Design a protein around this ligand. Structure first.
Ligand code: NA
Ligand code: NA
Lengths: 489, 489, 489, 489
C-alpha cells in the first residue's frame, strides 16, 4: 500500500458560481460571469456554451446531500468558495478605508471596525447567513474548511464585461481598475470577520492567472471580458497580485489563521533536452512571476515591501502538462500535448486525453509540487486535480496516479498537507457549460440527484484508509489505449 | 433502488482449466485443451494465442485469496468447475457399468457401488482431495457452491485433438465416440459420490454448444479438435445431449440435489420486422434443439423417454445478442452486431463493443431469461455474464445494466435464482489466451496478485445490499461513446 | 457520359490576397487583412494561424505557370480578384464625386471622367499594369476572364481592424462607414475603366455575407475586425448591399458587360420534416435578404429604386449544407452536419467531412442552384466549389459529384453557365493559413512549385471533354468510409 | 522527372481464376479453388468469403475492353496466367512420358512430340483457342506478353482439396503428390508448344510460397486444402521446386525464350539493430531457400544438378514488409507492421495500412530488388505491386512511390526490366472475395463495366512518358495520416 500521514487531508474543491445555482431561490444574476454567459452575442459566437448556471447542480439548496456524500466517502476537507456578488450585490465604494494609492500601486488598505460595520449594513444578509449555514453543516461532518474568497466572478457593479468586450474601458472594468483591489480588501476583511470561526485556512483567490490570461489574451476561451489586450492582461495581473497582498493583510488584521493563494499550474516539460532552458522560461513567465511577487515582493523588476511575505501556504491546482519548445530566445507550447490536445485523443507520448483534450500526465504533479517546494518552502495543498470524463474511463487511473505522485512528493520531503479533488460533483464548467463533467459524482441536471461514479468508490477507499490500498494500487498506471478513442494522427 | 429478494444469489463463475494453473505443482498436461494450445502448428497458424495455461492465475494454489476477495465483495455463490483430466488422467474404460447402447444411442448407464469403488482406486487422489480442500474453504466463507462437472477439456485418453485435426478419426475422438458418454456418466457419478456434501446444485456441463460448434464448424475459433465437419458437429451435439442425460441419471442415483446444465446464449434479434420468423428459426436451431432434447426428450424428430425430464434448472450464460436476417427460408447472422463486431468498435445501433468485439446489449439478457422461462418454466440461474475489458471502461455499465435486466425478469415473474458474473478474476480465455480480461479483479500474471477494478467495488455494493443502490443505478445505461474507440465505419 | 453544352465554362476561381504573394516584390502590407494576420495578439490568441500571406504561392510572380497548368488542364474560364489595397494604397477620399447620401443611405455615386483621371494619378502604376499583364496572359491561353473587384481585404486607410477590434470605432472602420461605399464605387469605376477590354463579366464582390458575419458575429473565426457586434454586422451588411449597387451603377456607366455578385451559400436542409419552415427562415435570413435587396430593391422592409435591378448574374459559391432545426419560431444550425462537423469526421448521415470539417453534400449544389433560379431567373455561375483535402482522398468524388449536380440543374432548366473550382492551386486560407489545401494543384510553399493531384487529372478529363466521361462517372458517389477517419461518435 | 529507359516495360499482371469468369460461357467449375470457395463448410466457417468467381469481372468474355483500357493507359506489357483446369479438365496421367523418379525426386521429365500430340487430343479446344484469341488481341495493342503457367488452382482431378482438408490423404493430393510434378511438366510443354508465338517470356508459376505456406501452415488464410501440416508444407514446397525445374526443362525443349518464376516477397526488416541477424534468417527461410534450389541446385542440404541453373529471370511480387525480431536463435514476425496490420490502420512507424492491413512501405521494393540482384544477378521484373484500396486513397501515393523505388534500383545497377501493377482491374481476391479491390480500374460486378480510378490516370502519365513526370513526383511520399482511419492504438 501507499500510506499517507494520519493528519493528511483528503477532500474536494468547489466554486460558488459553478455549483451553487440550480435550486429555487438560488439564482444570482449580479455577477459579470452571469451576464457574460447569458449574453446573446457571446452565445451566438460560440464563445460560451449557451448553458446557464441557474440550471446547475444546486449546492445552494442541496448542500446537505453534497455533504452527506462527502462524509460517506470519508472526506476530511473541503475548499469551497464564497461569491462576492452574492454578499455585496450593491457597491461598497462609499465605505471609507485608509488606503495608500500611488498611481497604479495600492500599498496598503486598512479596514477599520467602523468600515466592517458599514459593510455589514450593506451586505446581503441571506447570502452571508446561508454561507454560515452551509459551512456549519460541512464542519458538522468532520470536514475541515478551507475558505476561498474569490473564484472569478465579480459583482456587476465592479465589472461590466460586455461593455469592456465592446471596448468601453470607462465602464466598470474589474481587474483593470485599482479600485477593485481596494474593494476586494474590504470584501476579504468582511468575510473573515463574519465567518472566521468556521475556517481552518483561507485562500484569497483561485487561479488568478486564468482570470488575467483568459480574460485578455486567450480570448477564444470565452472568458470575460474577452477584450484582447496584452497590456490589459498585465494590468489585471498586477492588480490581482496587489489584491492578494491587500487581502492577506486585511484578513490577517482579523485572524491569524493561514492565508494562502490557489493557482493554476502545468508542468512545463521540454520537448527535447535542447528545450530545457525554454521550459525554465515558461515556468518563470507563467508561474514564478506571480509567486515571486507575493512571496519575495519582486514585481516588474522592483521590490515592494508591501508585497513581500504575503503568503502562508500555496494551493497547487494541477490537471496536466504543457510541452515547451524553444523558439529563438523565447518558447512556444507544442500542440498535441498537455492542455492542447484533441478531446478524447492521444498525445504523441501515447497518453490518453480527457474530454477537455488534456493529457494524462500524473508525473507533472510531482514535478510541480517539488518545484514550488524547492523555491519557496511553503506548505502546499493540492487544491485541484481531476478530469473531464463523462464515462469514468480515465478517472480511476487519473485519481490513483495523481494521489500516488503526491505521496512521492511527500516521501521526498515536500510538505504537502492534503489532496482536494476537483470535484465532488459535476458542475458548470465556465464557457464550456455542463458538458465537461469533473465529478466523482455525476449530476443529473434535471433531477439534481447525485450519482456515484466508480471513481467515487475508489476515492472512498483512499480517504477512509488514508492510503492507496493494495487492492487499488494497480490504478497508478496509464489507461489502456485500445478501448479509448484514438483521435486523429 | 432496484432490490432483489433476500435469498437471491450474487456470485461468480469460474472454470478449472481457465483459472487453476499458474502456481507450482498445479500443472495439468493431460487434457486435450492443454495439448491443443501447446501444439506448434496451431500456434504458428494463429489458431491459438501462444499463451499457455500453466502461466495463469493460479487458483489451484491461491484459492484462499480468491475466496478472500469474493467474501470481501459480499458474494454468496460460486459456480466452479472440476476437471475430468485431473481426476482421471488414466483411462476408466475398463470399469464395468451396466449400459444399454443401441448403435449411436446410449439409453442408460448404471454405475454400481462396485464401479465407484473401482473408479476411486483409479482416481488421482491429490486432485480429488484438493478439490475438497478448495471447495470446503469456499463454503467456509458463506458461499454456496454450484459444482459444474464439465467445462470443455477432456482427458487426453479420451480425445487426441491433434490426431483428430489431422483427420485420423480412429484416434481417441472425444465427443464423436459414444464411449465418451459412458465414461462421462462414470465420472459424474464419481464426483457426486465424492463431493456431494459440499454441493448445493450440480451442472453437468457448460456451453456444450460451444464444444460442438466451435470444435467442428466455426474452426477459425481455434477450438479443438478444429476438424471442419458439420456431420461431426451433429454427432458431438447428440453425444453431449446423451452425456447430459446419462450424467443426470448417474448423479441422481447418488443425490437428489438439483441437476442442471449451463448453456451459451445469445438474444437472437431480428434486423427488421421482416426477420422475426428468421430470428425464431435461429432460436430453435441454436437453443431449443438442445433443451427440447433434455427437457422434452425430443431429438432429431423422435422422442426418447430416456432423455425426457433430465433437467432441474437452467444456467443461462449471456454476453451479447446475434442479429438475424432472413436469407430465403434460412437465416444469417448480420456482421457488425452482437458477437460479430469490431473489437472496441461500435455497432450500427450505437452500442459500444468489448475487447472481444461483443456488443453492449443488456436487454438481451431479459429476453433470453423470459424466453427460457416461458418455454420450460424451470428455475434459471444466470451462470455467466461479463465483458472482456482491460480498462474497466464498459464493465461498470455492463454489470449494472445486466443486473438490472435480471431484476426486470424477476419482476415479470421469471424464477431467476441468482446472478454469477464471469468472472471474479481474469483467466485464460481459451484460444485467445490471457489478453481477454473478464475479471472484476485484474490478475498480474507475473506476481499472481489480484487487483480490484472499480467494477469490483460496484459489485460489492450490489452484493452486500442485494440491490442496485441509488448511488449506482445510473450505471444502468449505455457507456458514453465519445471517449471510446469509434472503430471503423 | 454526362455531357455539358459546347459553350459551358469549366475553370477556377482565385483571390488576390490568397494567392498573389510569395515571390519577390509581391508583398502587399497595406491591407486590413495583412495587418490582421500579422497582429501579435491575434496570433497569440489563435485567432489567426500565424502563417503569413507573403509566404504564399506566388501567383504575382509565377502567374504564367499557373496559367500553363490551367491551359494544360483544358480550363476555359477563370474568376480572379484584384486587390483594392494594391491599386489604391493611399486614400482616395479627396477625389470628388457626385454622391447623394441621406444619413446611412448612399442613393447614387456618379464618377466623372475627371474623377477617373484624378484616380489614375493616385493609383499604384505597378499594380494596375501588373494586373493587365497577368490577365492578358490568362486571355492568351483561351481562358475567359471574370474579374471580381473585392474579395475581403480593404486598404488600411479604409479599415484599421486592430483599432476596431479594440473598440475604437472612430478609427477607419471599413464597412461600418458609408464613406467606404463611395470609395468602393470610385475603385470599381476605375478598375473597369482600366481593364474592361480584358473582362468578360464582372463581379462586384465575393461572399459579402462572410465579411459581415465573420467580421462582427462569428468572431471565433478570426476574421477582421473581430469586433463582436450584431448591430455592426447589420450595418456592414447594408453597406455591402449599397456598395454592390453603387459599384454596379459605376461599372455600368463605363461598360455594358454583365455585372454580378458572388455569395457564400449553403443548402439549408431541415433535420426533420417538422423543420421545413425553419429551413425556409434560414434561407431568407442568410441568403434572400441580400439578394432581395440587390435584385428587388427590398431592404429592411422598404423598397429602394436605387437598389432594384442591380444584378445581371449570380455567382454561386457552394461547399456544403447547413442542417436546420426549428427552435421555437426561430431556428438553429445543428452541429455535426454541414459546416459544423468534426475535421476529418463523419456526419450522422454517413457523409465524410473534409479537413475543414465540411460535410460531403453534393446534392445541396443542385438545390441551391434550383432555388436561386426559381426565385430570380438570373444566369448562374458556380463560382466556387471545392474541398480542403491534403491527401486528395475525397476531392475526386467531391469534384465529379458536384459537377454532376450542376448538370442535373442544367437538365432541369437552370441557366448555369459554368463551373469554377476553388481552386486551381493551394493558397492562403484566411485565418486558417496554409494548412487548408483546396487546390487541384498542391503547392510546395518552399519551392513555389505546383504539383498535380490526381483530381487535377480528373478535372482535365472533364474540361477537355466538356463531360463527365464514362471512365470517371463512378466518382459521382460518396467516398467509401472504411479507409477514412471515423471521427468521434 | 524520374525517367526510365526507352525499353522499360510498364504494364499489369492478372490471374485467370481471379479475372476470367463473370461472362456467360466462362464458368470453370473444374478446379480445386472453385470447389474450395463453393464448399459450404468453408463458407460457414468464414474460411472463404462466400463470394464466387463466376460473379467476377469477366475477362474471358470482355478481354477486348480490358485491353482497350490498357492500351489507352499506354501499357506495354502484361503478365497473364492460363488455367490448367481449363486446358486439361480431364486427367493426363495416361500420357506416357520419359521421367526419372527416385522416390520423392523427379530428376527429369522428357515430353516427346508423340506425348504433345496425345495431350492435344485430350485438351479442351475451346480453352486453348480462346487463350490464343485473347492473347492475340493483347499483342495487337502493342502489349508484350509474359505468360505465367500456374497461379494456384489445380484441376480437380489432381487435387480434391475438401478430401485433403478432411485428412483423406489418399485422395488426389495436389502438390503432395510427385505425380503432379510430372503432370505439370506435361502441361507446361503443351502450352508452350501451342502458344509460343504469342509469348515474350514465360513464368512457370506464381507465388509458390503462398501455395505451400497458406495451404498447409497459415490455415486461417482459408486457402486450399487448409490441411494443417507443416510436413505437408515442406513436401509441397519441394514438389513446387521440382515442378518449376521440370517445367523449365520442358518449355526449353520447345522454345529458347526466357523462363522464369514469380514469387511472393516481403522486405524483412529488423525491428531493432539487434534483430539484423534474425531478419537475415527470415530472408533465407522465406526466400532464398526456394531460389537457391532453382538457381544453385541447393535443396535440403544437397545439391542437385537437375535443379541448378533452371532460371532465366525472376518476377518480384512485392506489397509490403515484414518486421522481424529475434526470438532466441529463431525469429518472429512482429504484429502491427507489414502484412500484419490492422485493416485501414496505421503502423507504429506512422505508415498507413491498406484495406488488407498491409503497411505502406515502398522502400522495401528497392531492398528486395537489390537483394535478389546481389545474390543471383538475374534479370528482374516487378511482376506485382499494388494495394487493396476501394477509395483510391493510398493508391496514388503507393503507385508513384513504388515506381520511384524501382527507378532507384535501376540507378544503382539492378537490371529491372519492367514494372507490372497488380492489377489493371479489380478481381476475385481468393478467400477474401471481391471486397479487396486492387484495380487501377474499379469493376462494377453487376454491370461488368470498368471504371477509371484516378490512379489509372496517374499510371497513364507514367506509362506514356516512361517517367514519373514533374507533375506527379510529389506522390512519391507517404499518404497524409489525418484524413485516414487511425485504427486502434
Ligand atoms: Na471505468
Ligand atoms: Na485519392
Amino acid at each position: 500500500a501507499v500510506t499517507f500521514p494520519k493528519d493528511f487531508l483528503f477532500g474536494w474543491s468547489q466554486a460558488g458560481f459553478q455549483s451553487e445555482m440550480g435550486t429555487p431561490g438560488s439564482e444570482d444574476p449580479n455577477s459579470d460571469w452571469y451576464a457574460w454567459v447569458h449574453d446573446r452575442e457571446n452565445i451566438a459566437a460560440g464563445l460560451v456554451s449557451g448553458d446557464f448556471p441557474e440550471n446547475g447542480p444546486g449546492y445552494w439548496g442541496n448542500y446537505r446531500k453534497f455533504h452527506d456524500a462527502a462524509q460517506a466517502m470519508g472526506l476530511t476537507a473541503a475548499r469551497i468558495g464564497v461569491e462576492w456578488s452574492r454578499i455585496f450585490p450593491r457597491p461598497t465604494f462609499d465605505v471609507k478605508v485608509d488606503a495608500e494609492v500611488k498611481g497604479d500601486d495600492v500599498l496598503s488598505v486598512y479596514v477599520s471596525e467602523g468600515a466592517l460595520e458599514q459593510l455589514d449594513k450593506m451586505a446581503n444578509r441571506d447570502a452571508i447567513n446561508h454561507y454560515r449555514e452551509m459551512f456549519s453543516d460541512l464542519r458538522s461532518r468532520g470536514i475541515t474548511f478551507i475558505l476561498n474568497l474569490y473564484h472569478w466572478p465579480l459583482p456587476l457593479w465592479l465589472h461590466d464585461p460586455i461593455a469592456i468586450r465592446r471596448g468601453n474601458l470607462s465602464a466598470p472594468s474589474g481587474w483593470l481598475d485599482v479600485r477593485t483591489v481596494i474593494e476586494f480588501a474590504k470584501f476579504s476583511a468582511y468575510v473573515a470577520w463574519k465567518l472566521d470561526d468556521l475556517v481552518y485556512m483561507y485562500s484569497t483567490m483561485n487561479e488568478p492567472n486564468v482570470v488575467w490570461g483568459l480574460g485578455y489574451a486567450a480570448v477564444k476561451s470565452g472568458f470575460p471580458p474577452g477584450y484582447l489586450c496584452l497590456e490589459c492582461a498585465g494590468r489585471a495581473m498586477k492588480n490581482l497580485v496587489q489584491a492578494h497582498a491587500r487581502a492577506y493583510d486585511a484578513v490577517k488584521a482579523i485572524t491569524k489563521k493561514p492565508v494562502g493563494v490557489i493557482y493554476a499550474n502545468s508542468d512545463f516539460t521540454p520537448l527535447t533536452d535542447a528545450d530545457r532552458e525554454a521550459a525554465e522560461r515558461a515556468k518563470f513567465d507563467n508561474r514564478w512571476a506571480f509567486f515571486d511577487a507575493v512571496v519575495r515582493g519582486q514585481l516588474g523588476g522592483s521590490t515592494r515591501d508591501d508585497l513581500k511575505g504575503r503568503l502562508d501556504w500555496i494551493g497547487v491546482n494541477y490537471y496536466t502538462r504543457q510541452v515547451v519548445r524553444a523558439r529563438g530566445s523565447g518558447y512556444e507550447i507544442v500542440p498535441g500535448y498537455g492542455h492542447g490536445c484533441e478531446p478524447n485523443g492521444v498525445s504523441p507520448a501515447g497518453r490518453p486525453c480527457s474530454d477537455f483534450g488534456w493529457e494524462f500526465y500524473p508525473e507533472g504533479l510531482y514535478n510541480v509540487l517539488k518545484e514550488y517546494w524547492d523555491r519557496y518552502h511553503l506548505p502546499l495543498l493540492v487544491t485541484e486535480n481531476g478530469i473531464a470524463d463523462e464515462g469514468d474511463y480515465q478517472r480511476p487511473y487519473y485519481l490513483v496516479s495523481h494521489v500516488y505522485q503526491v505521496h512521492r512528493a511527500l516521501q521526498d520531503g515536500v510538505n504537502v498537507i492534503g489532496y482536494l479533488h476537483w470535484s465532488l460533483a459535476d458542475n458548470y464548467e465556465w464557457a464550456s457549460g455542463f458538458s465537461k463533467r469533473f465529478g466523482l459524482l455525476m449530476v443529473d441536471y434535471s433531477t439534481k440527484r447525485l450519482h456515484w461514479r466508480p471513481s467515487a468508490f475508489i476515492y472512498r477507499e483512499i480517504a477512509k484508509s488514508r492510503a492507496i490500498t493494495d487492492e487499488i494500487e494497480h490504478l497508478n498506471s496509464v489507461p489502456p489505449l485500445r478501448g479509448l478513442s484514438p483521435g486523429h494522427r
